[PDB]
Amino acid sequence: SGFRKMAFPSGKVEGCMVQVTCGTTTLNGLWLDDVVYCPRHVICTSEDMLNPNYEDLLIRKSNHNFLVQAGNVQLRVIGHSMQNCVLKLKVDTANPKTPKYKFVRIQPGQTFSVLACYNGSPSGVYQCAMRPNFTIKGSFLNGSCGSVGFNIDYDCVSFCYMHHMELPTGVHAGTDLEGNFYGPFVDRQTAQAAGTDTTITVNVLAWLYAAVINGDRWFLNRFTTTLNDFNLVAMKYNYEPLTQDHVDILGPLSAQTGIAVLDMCASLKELLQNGMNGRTILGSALLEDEFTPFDVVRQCSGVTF
Amino acid sequence: SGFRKMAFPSGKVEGCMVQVTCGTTTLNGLWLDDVVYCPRHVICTSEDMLNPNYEDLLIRKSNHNFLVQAGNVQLRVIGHSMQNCVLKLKVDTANPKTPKYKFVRIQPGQTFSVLACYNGSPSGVYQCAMRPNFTIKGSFLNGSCGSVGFNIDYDCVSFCYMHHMELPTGVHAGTDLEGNFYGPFVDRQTAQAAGTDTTITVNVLAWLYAAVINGDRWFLNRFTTTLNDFNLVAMKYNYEPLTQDHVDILGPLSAQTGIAVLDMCASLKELLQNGMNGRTILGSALLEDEFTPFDVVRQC
Numbered sequence: 001s002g003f004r005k006m007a008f009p010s011g012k013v014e015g016c017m018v019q020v021t022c023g024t025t026t027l028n029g030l031w032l033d034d035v036v037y038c039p040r041h042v043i044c045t046s047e048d049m050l051n052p053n054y055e056d057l058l059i060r061k062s063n064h065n066f067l068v069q070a071g072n073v074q075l076r077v078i079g080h081s082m083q084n085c086v087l088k089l090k091v092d093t094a095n096p097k098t099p100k101y102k103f104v105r106i107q108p109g110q111t112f113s114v115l116a117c118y119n120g121s122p123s124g125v126y127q128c129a130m131r132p133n134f135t136i137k138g139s140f141l142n143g144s145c146g147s148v149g150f151n152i153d154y155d156c157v158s159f160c161y162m163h164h165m166e167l168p169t170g171v172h173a174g175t176d177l178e179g180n181f182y183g184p185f186v187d188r189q190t191a192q193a194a195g196t197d198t199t200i201t202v203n204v205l206a207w208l209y210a211a212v213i214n215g216d217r218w219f220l221n222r223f224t225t226t227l228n229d230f231n232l233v234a235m236k237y238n239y240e241p242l243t244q245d246h247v248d249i250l251g252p253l254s255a256q257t258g259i260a261v262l263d264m265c266a267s268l269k270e271l272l273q274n275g276m277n278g279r280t281i282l283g284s285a286l287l288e289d290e291f292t293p294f295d296v297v298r299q300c301s302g303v304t305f
Numbered sequence: 306s307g308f309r310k311m312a313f314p315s316g317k318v319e320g321c322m323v324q325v326t327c328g329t330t331t332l333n334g335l336w337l338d339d340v341v342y343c344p345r346h347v348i349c350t351s352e353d354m355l356n357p358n359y360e361d362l363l364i365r366k367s368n369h370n371f372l373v374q375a376g377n378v379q380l381r382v383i384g385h386s387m388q389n390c391v392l393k394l395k396v397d398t399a400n401p402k403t404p405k406y407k408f409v410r411i412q413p414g415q416t417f418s419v420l421a422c423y424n425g426s427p428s429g430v431y432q433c434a435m436r437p438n439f440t441i442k443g444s445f446l447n448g449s450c451g452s453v454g455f456n457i458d459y460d461c462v463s464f465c466y467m468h469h470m471e472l473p474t475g476v477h478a479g480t481d482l483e484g485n486f487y488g489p490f491v492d493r494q495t496a497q498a499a500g501t502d503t504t505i506t507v508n509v510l511a512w513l514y515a516a517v518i519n520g521d522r523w524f525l526n527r528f529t530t531t532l533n534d535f536n537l538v539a540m541k542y543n544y545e546p547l548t549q550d551h552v553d554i555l556g557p558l559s560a561q562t563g564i565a566v567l568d569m570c571a572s573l574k575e576l577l578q579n580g581m582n583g584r585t586i587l588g589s590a591l592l593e594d595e596f597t598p599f600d601v602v603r604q605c
């Protein structure tokens with residue numbers, strides 16, 4: 001019993017974190033095989049950030065301008081190139097701790113673990129979701145750029161996020177490991193803002209199934225709803241639309257608890273329209289949307305890596 | 306910016322998790338140097354659990370009755386001894402992945418990371434606090450016994466908890482790594498219950514200081530309180546008493562934000578009286594008590 005916000009074990013990623021220094025700037029890099037990946041903004045001064053021409057700034061750098069430190073060992077950079085907003089530093093040593101890995105681009109609503117790092121040293125691990133507005137509500141201080149987000153599927157690490165920026169509201173923006181930003185963000189010090197966000201409906205439903213599995217049933221009711229009527233209510237409360245794909249994905253949890261997905265939607269509708277009435281669900285007074293249906297099944301079944 | 310419930314990176318502990326099997330029972334063990342630590346209840350059958358005589362059950366076991374698996378490698382048990390409620394299995398191989406470590410017994414209110422494991426394989430990592438009633442609100446299924454709690458301040462892993470039991474309310478009980486239970490619990494299936502839980506007041510105050518550091522001030526007020534008047538109020542909401550030690554520990558956060566500890570106590574009293582009025586503090590509609598003053602300074 002019990003239901004916690006749980007991250008994947010971070011060991012496979014810890015063995016890939018390195019420190020990347022370019023001039024006065026130090027941030028984190030991900031060392032996989034003979035390449036160190038890091039935000040291309042590592043080459044910018046604060047003035048360069050105002051309006052950077054990354055190709056022009058990079059052409060002025062040599063391999064020896066990039067200092068890469070893996071623990072207490074300096075790696076030698078033997079090549080450098082840019083792919084979108086990520087800088088790829090070729091090094092002369094393949095990382096012996098390189099796990100089985102893939103680069104995957106996730107969709108909003110998907111969760112992942114973040115290994116927050118400073119000076120190439122892991123500091124903490126937490127779980128978060130890619131918001132519908134493409135930001136993450138992370139916890140990152142100055143020096144955290146290059147920290148990565150990942151999932152583990154069997155023995156394979158799927159890297160899905162690299163940290164680049166903090167927006168004025170304190171939320172975060174980054175790229176996939178191919179350097180493509182999540183969201184309409186750019187790696188430039190210019191006015192940017194997180195758009196209006198919405199709640200990840202399928203994840204709230206998954207978390208309500210988790211509460212039922214853990215013995216919390218007060219919110220259940222005799223009612224059901226149509227998918228269209230539920231989506232009218234979801235639109236009203238700034239919840240993401242629930243698709244037939246979401247309903248299908250919740251099938252296993254629906255079969256286990258005996259509560260049809262549309263039956264759980266009618267519980268959610270009542271919670272949106274009436275609140276919790278002083279009660280809590282899994283120790284929360286808010287509807288939690290950072291557990292996917294897969295996270296709920298994994299946590300309630302004890303999947304290992 | 307941002308404030309998350311953050312666990313320590315688990316890699317140093319992942320490299321210590323092994324599977325321990327004794328007869329029909331399989332659970333997790335912690336392999337440090339040439340010793341594998343695990344709950345002594347691994348030697349019990351479901352029947353033995355009501356009134357086990359562990360000394361008598363253990364004397365009947367030989368080294369070959371314990372199967373220890375580290376990944377896909379079977380380790381050879383060359384000795385076994387019990388220390389309180391933990392079984393220590395001496396093995397013929399020192400763990401090459403043994404980090405710098407220590408065993409520390411924590412106090413209620415302290416937080417730690419749990420690396421939940423099944424069959425010697427890590428499943429996930431999360432952050433816990435030792436509740437005032439000596440239980441932890443974990444996430445543990447059957448097979449999770451032997452999973453450990455730890456902190457990693459400055460490259461040294463301080464192991465503070467080993468999982469042993471789930472109480473009827475779904476909360477969890479365990480021991481330190483010397484096998485001493487936290488709380489009045491025993492490793493037997495006799496009727497046991499978690500005592501009435503209370504809120505960790507010093508941690509709620511630390512988290513309010515985290516909220517001020519992150520730019521939120523809506524809950525502040527023009528009032529202060531005496532420590533005794535605060536405790537008289539807080540006790541009515543099932544909050545733990547705030548001691549002068551707690552006030553001293555909050556000194557650094559008080560100096561950084563410019564909000565005296567007793568001024569923050571007055572904000573807490575008001576929050577308990579009013580609720581949040583539809584507002585949130587650091588993304589929460591409840592007062593969070595699983596961040597210590599040390600955690601707040603580390604993260605902010």
Ligand SMILES: CO[C@@]1(C(=O)Nc2cncc3ccccc23)CCOc2ccc(Cl)cc21
Nearest residue numbers: 041140141142164165166186187188189306
């Ligand atoms: C590279 O630095 C920037 C940044 O956001 N960095 C940070 C990222 N995370 C947490 C931060 C906490 C505090 C201070 C900075 C943080 C700030 C300057 O302008 C920009 C502009 C664009 C980009 Cl892609 C990054 C940056």
Ligand SMILES: CO[C@@]1(C(=O)Nc2cncc3ccccc23)CCOc2ccc(Cl)cc21
Nearest residue numbers: 001346354445446447469470471492493494
């Ligand atoms: C030895 O296992 C017991 C147990 O609590 N195990 C568990 C520990 N964690 C999570 C659990 C989730 C679901 C099922 C059991 C769990 C159950 C029998 O009585 C007892 C009595 C004492 C002790 Cl020290 C352990 C136990």
